[PDB]
Write an enzyme that holds these catalytic residues in place. Sequence first.
Site, short mmCIF file in Angstrom:
data_model
loop_
_atom_site.label_atom_id
_atom_site.label_comp_id
_atom_site.label_asym_id
_atom_site.label_seq_id
_atom_site.Cartn_x
_atom_site.Cartn_y
_atom_site.Cartn_z
N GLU A 256 5.76 -87.78 32.37
CA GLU A 256 5.92 -87.74 33.83
C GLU A 256 6.68 -86.70 34.31
OE1 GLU A 256 8.63 -91.60 33.20
OE2 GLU A 256 6.76 -92.43 34.21
N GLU A 332 1.11 -96.13 27.74
CA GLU A 332 2.21 -97.27 28.07
C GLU A 332 1.44 -98.36 28.91
OE1 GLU A 332 5.54 -95.69 30.24
OE2 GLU A 332 5.54 -93.70 28.97
N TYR A 333 1.63 -99.63 28.29
CA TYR A 333 1.35 -100.83 28.88
C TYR A 333 1.87 -101.98 28.77
CZ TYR A 333 -1.25 -102.64 24.74
OH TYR A 333 -1.49 -103.11 23.42
N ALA A 334 2.07 -103.23 29.10
CA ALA A 334 2.33 -104.28 28.90
C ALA A 334 3.94 -104.21 28.80
CB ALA A 334 2.02 -104.91 27.52
N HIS A 335 4.57 -104.02 29.89
CA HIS A 335 6.18 -103.58 29.95
C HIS A 335 6.80 -104.66 29.56
CE1 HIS A 335 9.95 -102.68 32.08
NE2 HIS A 335 9.40 -101.38 31.92
N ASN A 392 23.37 -95.65 38.40
CA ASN A 392 22.83 -96.01 37.05
C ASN A 392 21.57 -96.80 37.54
OD1 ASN A 392 23.34 -99.12 36.96
ND2 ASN A 392 25.36 -98.20 37.40
N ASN A 399 13.66 -103.11 27.79
CA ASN A 399 12.25 -103.63 27.89
C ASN A 399 11.41 -103.50 26.61
OD1 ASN A 399 13.02 -101.25 30.09
ND2 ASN A 399 11.46 -100.69 28.73
#
Lengths: 409, 204
Positions: A256, A332-335, A392, A399
């Site tokens: 990112e 990245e997938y399926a949080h 914050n 997660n």
Amino acid sequence: SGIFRDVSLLHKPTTQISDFHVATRFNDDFSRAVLEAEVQMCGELRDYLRVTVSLWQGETQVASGTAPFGGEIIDERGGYADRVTLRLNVENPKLWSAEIPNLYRAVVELHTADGTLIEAEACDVGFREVRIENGLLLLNGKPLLIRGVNRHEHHPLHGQVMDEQTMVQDILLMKQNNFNAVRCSHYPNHPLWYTLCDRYGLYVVDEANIETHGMVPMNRLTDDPRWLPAMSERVTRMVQRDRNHPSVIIWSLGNESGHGANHDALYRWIKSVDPSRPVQYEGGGADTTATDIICPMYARVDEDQPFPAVPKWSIKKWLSLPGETRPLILCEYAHAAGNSLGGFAKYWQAFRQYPRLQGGFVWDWVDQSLIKYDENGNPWSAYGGDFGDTPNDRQFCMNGLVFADRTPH
Amino acid sequence: DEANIETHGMVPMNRLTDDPRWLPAMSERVTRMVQRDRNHPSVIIWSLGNESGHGANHDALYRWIKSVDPSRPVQYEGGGADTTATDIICPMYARVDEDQPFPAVPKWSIKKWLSLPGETRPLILCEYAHAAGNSLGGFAKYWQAFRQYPRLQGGFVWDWVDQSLIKYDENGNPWSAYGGDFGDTPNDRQFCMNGLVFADRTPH
Ligand code: NA
Ligand code: NA
Ligand code: NA
Ligand code: NA
């Protein structure tokens, strides 16, 4: 903050091995291989100096080669008098994979012709080829199916200090739950992590410590040439440190930080210095010129999310966009925030039906909760804001597929 | 525009199309078609025929067309719908999400077909949504896919008009007849009827 990883003292002779790269090339059916070891030294060059590289499979010596320093001619000025490359033939090599982590041991000896040892270095060697061909990521000629997960270095009591026990525990739980790959989100890990992945058998995505998510736009620094130096050190020193680990099969330019020209430059640097591994990066749309793999984060299976500039196309659709040919593996997938993973089966049905959909890395392994104690001394799991920290992002730090103490969700 | 060439009944389907001795007869059916219709703007794609498997004759005639008329793409479904004799993946009855891994000539889910390793061509079904009687169930599933996927560029429904013929009973009253109603045998009965409209063009 702090000195959160080991501190040590190393003594090296003045005439020393200053670097060494191990590579393994194979024939068409992987029935034959050649181990190439480039060794570099520092100190005073002497004709009597020698480098011996020997390869072992358990207590059995498979091969050994010796040579004085002096590399082949490189350009008009000659070659590297302080380097030497040893090439060892290996017939029917036992191949390395997450399925069967066969490892050999390469020993690098710096010594004199008369047989006096000056110093020795070494590493575990995994004979495997990683390459992308006809749109598929292949390991030893076979198309991988990445059953991965993103793993931060986090401990409920010790914060970001890692210990062997916790690392082994994570690896065992991962393999016992059918994971074969891990992404080092989002920085190089404690050095022991790679050793364990080499020996236990897990595919690793080694990622540069570069994330500028908070900038506006996200690539403000990564497209700025004045920041190229700083970024380059984060990528180059990572490659120079971990390039001999067989578990590392893919290099990542960070996370990112949008897509800047600095990314294209470093992407090419890696491709140039180490053609044995593909390079990926998700910034700027997951399919930029800085990635060999379409690696989106949270792209859905059938539903498109046409965001301006950086859309997240359905993964099935993404693969066939006009002119696209690369494999797709979600970084990245399926949080997994709390009661989650609904629709997980939908990703896997797609991964299995589409050859070029080669998996992804779940987000993520462990809740980033920290232990605090109440008035009575009883421990409890705390998250964002519980330490007086402000601003914050409260519970968004939790997660993972397992609680901070490694109990499964 | 499709050449008058179909050898569906052969076993295997390409017994004649892969035989150089039939190249002459096949070539005239393709070449004379192109020579006749090449100036028509409505014709945008040339087809080498239908259900004749995939033979070397197809490759030869495919090249001949590309050479003489590079203004139009050439397509052909035989032998798997994605052979070296077609510029367009043009399967018949490939489903939207479900694969049908038949040996040699699989009918992949059209969404999946597009992204098979190395595939880059557009996909347009030469035949889909068989309209036999009370049919066209799941038709919307195709269109949702056609609109979402750039390379799924549509298809041709099978088909337009029922091939029923008229017969008259003893009173002179006409009725729609199909295979077998003429004493013809062997025959494939009502299978000649799968149009979107009745023979008299009344809509189904
Ligand atoms: Na797949
Ligand atoms: Na989070
Ligand atoms: Na379309
Ligand atoms: Na029919």
